Amino acid sequence: VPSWPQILGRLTDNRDLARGQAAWAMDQIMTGNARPAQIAAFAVAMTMKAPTADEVGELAGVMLSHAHPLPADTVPDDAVDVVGTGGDGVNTVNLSTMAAIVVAAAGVPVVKHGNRALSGGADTLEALGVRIDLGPDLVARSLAEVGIGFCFAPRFHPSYRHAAAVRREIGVPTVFNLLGPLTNPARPRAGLIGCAFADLAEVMAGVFAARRSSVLVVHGDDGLDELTTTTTSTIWRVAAGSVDKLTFDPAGFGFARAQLDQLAGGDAQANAAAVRAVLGGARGPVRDAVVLNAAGAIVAHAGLSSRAEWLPAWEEGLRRASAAIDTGAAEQLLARWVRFGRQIL
Amino acid sequence: VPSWPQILGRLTDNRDLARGQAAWAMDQIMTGNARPAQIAAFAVAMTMKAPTADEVGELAGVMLSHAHPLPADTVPDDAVDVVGTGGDGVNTVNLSTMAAIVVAAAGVPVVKHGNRAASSLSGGADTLEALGVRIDLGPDLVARSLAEVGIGFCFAPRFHPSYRHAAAVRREIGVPTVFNLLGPLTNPARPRAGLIGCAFADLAEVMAGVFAARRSSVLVVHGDDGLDELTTTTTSTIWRVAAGSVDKLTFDPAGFGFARAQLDQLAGGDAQANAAAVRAVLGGARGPVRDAVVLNAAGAIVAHAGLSSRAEWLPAWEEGLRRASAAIDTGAAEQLLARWVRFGRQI
Numbered sequence: 001v002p003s004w005p006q007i008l009g010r011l012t013d014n015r016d017l018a019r020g021q022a023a024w025a026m027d028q029i030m031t032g033n034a035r036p037a038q039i040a041a042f043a044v045a046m047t048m049k050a051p052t053a054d055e056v057g058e059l060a061g062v063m064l065s066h067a068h069p070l071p072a073d074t075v076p077d078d079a080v081d082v083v084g085t086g087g088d089g090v091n092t093v094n095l096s097t098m099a100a101i102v103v104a105a106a107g108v109p110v111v112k113h114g115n116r117a118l119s120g121g122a123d124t125l126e127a128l129g130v131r132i133d134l135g136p137d138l139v140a141r142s143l144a145e146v147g148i149g150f151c152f153a154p155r156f157h158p159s160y161r162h163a164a165a166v167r168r169e170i171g172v173p174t175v176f177n178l179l180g181p182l183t184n185p186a187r188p189r190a191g192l193i194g195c196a197f198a199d200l201a202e203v204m205a206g207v208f209a210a211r212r213s214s215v216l217v218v219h220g221d222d223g224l225d226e227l228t229t230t231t232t233s234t235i236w237r238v239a240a241g242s243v244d245k246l247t248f249d250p251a252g253f254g255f256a257r258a259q260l261d262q263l264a265g266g267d268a269q270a271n272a273a274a275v276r277a278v279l280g281g282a283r284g285p286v287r288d289a290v291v292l293n294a295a296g297a298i299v300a301h302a303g304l305s306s307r308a309e310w311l312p313a314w315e316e317g318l319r320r321a322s323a324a325i326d327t328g329a330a331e332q333l334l335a336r337w338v339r340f341g342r343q344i345l
Numbered sequence: 346v347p348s349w350p351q352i353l354g355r356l357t358d359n360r361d362l363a364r365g366q367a368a369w370a371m372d373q374i375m376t377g378n379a380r381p382a383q384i385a386a387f388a389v390a391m392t393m394k395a396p397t398a399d400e401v402g403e404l405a406g407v408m409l410s411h412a413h414p415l416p417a418d419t420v421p422d423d424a425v426d427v428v429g430t431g432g433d434g435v436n437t438v439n440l441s442t443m444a445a446i447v448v449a450a451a452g453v454p455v456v457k458h459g460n461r462a463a464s465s466l467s468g469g470a471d472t473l474e475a476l477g478v479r480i481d482l483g484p485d486l487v488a489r490s491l492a493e494v495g496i497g498f499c500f501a502p503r504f505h506p507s508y509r510h511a512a513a514v515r516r517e518i519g520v521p522t523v524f525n526l527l528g529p530l531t532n533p534a535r536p537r538a539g540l541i542g543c544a545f546a547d548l549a550e551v552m553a554g555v556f557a558a559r560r561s562s563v564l565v566v567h568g569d570d571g572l573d574e575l576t577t578t579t580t581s582t583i584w585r586v587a588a589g590s591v592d593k594l595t596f597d598p599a600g601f602g603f604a605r606a607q608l609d610q611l612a613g614g615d616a617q618a619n620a621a622a623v624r625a626v627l628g629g630a631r632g633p634v635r636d637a638v639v640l641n642a643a644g645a646i647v648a649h650a651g652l653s654s655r656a657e658w659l660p661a662w663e664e665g666l667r668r669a670s671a672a673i674d675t676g677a678a679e680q681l682l683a684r685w686v687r688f689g690r691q692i
């Protein structure tokens with residue numbers, strides 16, 4: 001029978017947990033029965049031991065079981081997420097958020113997941129006039145009417161508040177930093193998932209493989225939790241319940257090498273202007289990075305329905321993303337999204 | 346500029362801390378400025394990194410800086426402690442506590458640091474209390490005990506009030522951490538000699554390193570069966586500390602004529618059962634428990650001899666064993682316990 005001394009003792013001995021132990025720990029955490037000290041000890045010990053896919057799957061599954069779901073039959077079974085763990089410590093413009101808009105504008109339903117954070121995805125969306133803190137019924141309506149929705153994490157995962165407080169108190173990255181992308185309450189079966197931590201990307205890929213999701217888990221070799229234009233990236237291609245590990249070089253599709261500071265973000269208003277520039281069709285490294293990540297999500301989406309050759313999949317993804325911007329569709333989609341939120345009153 | 350994210354990040358990156366960082370952390374903990382989550386994260390991360398002697402010395406040093414001291418000039422320069430980390434998981438009779446009484450009865454000043462059980466049925470403090478010894482005395486009365494009886498007991502919660510935040514976290518998480526090492530290293534009377542048991546084979550050397558940076562003569566001991574005492578069931582590893590250096594060796598009590606015992610023969614029970622075992626040994630009962638008590642008492646007498654160190658290792662052991670046995674057989678140990686009980690009752 002499970003207890004903190006047993007579970008923490010096992011982890012401090014550098015041993016993987018027994019089946020069900022991580023799940024028990026997470027139900028204690030999610031029910032308010034874990035003391036902050038227990039939560040912190042578990043988070044740290046799991047991290048230093050090095051979590052397995054099975055363990056993280058238990059944590060995520062339990063957390064999801066406590067989440068508010070979207071209403072039945074409201075999420076298309078081909079919806080995608082575009083999201084990363086964050087914590088790359090580089091402060092870029094909101095690449096995942098821009099890519100999400102472009103992906104949705106290319107005709108792929110997008111359901112994003114997150115929290116207010118210089119400027120996180122959510123904060124930038126608010127600066128653009130998007131309403132981010134909507135309940136399940138309204139996110140469902142948004143997805144139907146606009147092609148995109150946003151699940152505000154504190155609203156969907158209220159029972160995570162004990163863990164979230166501990167995470168702030170200790171500051172340091174832990175296994176808990178992995179859970180965001182794995183606990184999207186709309187349960188999209190495809191995604192482009194960034195991981196700031198190189199070894200943990202493989203673990204996240206394993207969890208998606210166990211779910212039979214179609215996902216690209218990506219880590220820029222400059223340490224970004226996005227597909228980068230500044231260097232090569234590592235991609236774990238998850239499809240058919242199997243993980244394929246690949247090096248990805250954007251130079252192969254004709255992208256010039258950018259510098260990290262060309263992707264630097266600022267406060268919410270600065271990042272909002274960046275979004276507007278890219279959707280208005282401005283060329284440069286920000287567009288290039290957006291188009292790259294949008295294409296990755298489109299490739300992952302394609303993987304739900306077919307196994308297509310990697311390189312042609314990418315060529316079509318890049319083309320779809322470029323056209324979504326250049327036809328005005330992406331700019332129009334953001335306007336529609338703002339319009340939707342203003343209609344709620 | 347020190348901070349929790351900086352220090353925790355370093356530890357989770359498996360890196361030793363910079364000089365002063367462990368001390369900063371410990372002072373935050375001891376002043377009530379660390380959140381329980383920060384205390385737990387620190388303890389666990391330090392444990393999994395593997396603490397160094399320098400880091401543990403900072404932790405213990407800071408903890409001592411917040412302790413109540415004994416009054417000036419009340420601890421003899423040659424006082425000895427006999428105490429371990431506990432946590433060996435065996436639930437034995439209280440070997441350190443019996444040894445301490447025997448050592449005091451042999452004429453060596455003893456100032457014992459101790460505490461209730463953490464995961465055993467009866468800790469040394471519990472057993473002492475069951476024997477009628479007063480465990481809850483303050484600095485002045487501990488000093489009087491030492492002068493009038495030849496032994497005193499510093500009850501950790503009375504001498505280390507500021508450790509309450511750390512203690513509570515330790516109980517909430519259960520798992521042993523670097524904090525389990527600190528009890529033997531923070532005797533508030535600061536005796537210069539000691540027989541110090543460590544249940545964690547990997548960390549005994551670290552504890553020895555901490556003592557080597559002090560003006561100390563100590564035997565840090567780990568039974569090769571896992572006991573945080575010198576064992577009679579097999580060999581023990583001893584880290585001998587003196588003059589700022591460490592001499593690691595394998596010790597075998599069969600060399601002194603001790604028969605090999607089985608661990609179950611050293612098994613304890615509740616405070617009442619463990620108090621009964623004390624009375625049996627001090628009354629002259631022969632057997633495995635006596636043997637282990639005599640062995641550990643002698644070990645403490647050897648550490649004490651290492652302070653004003655004429656004697657070489659082997660002759661020191663021979664004399665320690667003679668003195669420890671004689672303290673029991675002449676009734677001196679039984680008499681000294683009665684005297685310690687009388688002292689506490691005379692208020």
Ligand SMILES: O=P(O)(O)OC[C@H]1O[C@H](OP(=O)(O)OP(=O)(O)O)[C@H](O)[C@@H]1O
Nearest residue numbers: 083084086087094095096097114120121
């Ligand atoms: O502050 P950090 O921990 O570095 O994280 C920066 C952002 O990255 C993640 O979001 P997401 O990938 O959805 O948004 P973005 O890429 O558009 O910023 C995370 O939810 C934050 O919004």
Ligand SMILES: O=P(O)(O)OC[C@H]1O[C@H](OP(=O)(O)OP(=O)(O)O)[C@H](O)[C@@H]1O
Nearest residue numbers: 429431432439441442463464465468469
């Ligand atoms: O419950 P545990 O964690 O196993 O610890 C058992 C005892 O070990 C330590 O004492 P000490 O060495 O002073 O006493 P003893 O050897 O006489 O029991 C500790 O202060 C406990 O009292």
Ligand SMILES: Cc1cccc(C(=O)O)c1N
Nearest residue numbers: 153154157158160161164
């Ligand atoms: C994801 C999440 C869920 C619930 C509460 C919080 C919080 O920051 O308190 C949070 N960050």
Ligand SMILES: Cc1cccc(C(=O)O)c1N
Nearest residue numbers: 501502505506508509512
């Ligand atoms: C050593 C010590 C100091 C202060 C409080 C406690 C406690 O157990 O609560 C304690 N164990």
Ligand SMILES: [Mg+2]
Nearest residue numbers: 083084096194
């Ligand atoms: Mg991102």
Ligand SMILES: [Mg+2]
Nearest residue numbers: 428429441542
């Ligand atoms: Mg002991």
Ligand SMILES: [Mg+2]
Nearest residue numbers: 429431573574
């Ligand atoms: Mg012991």
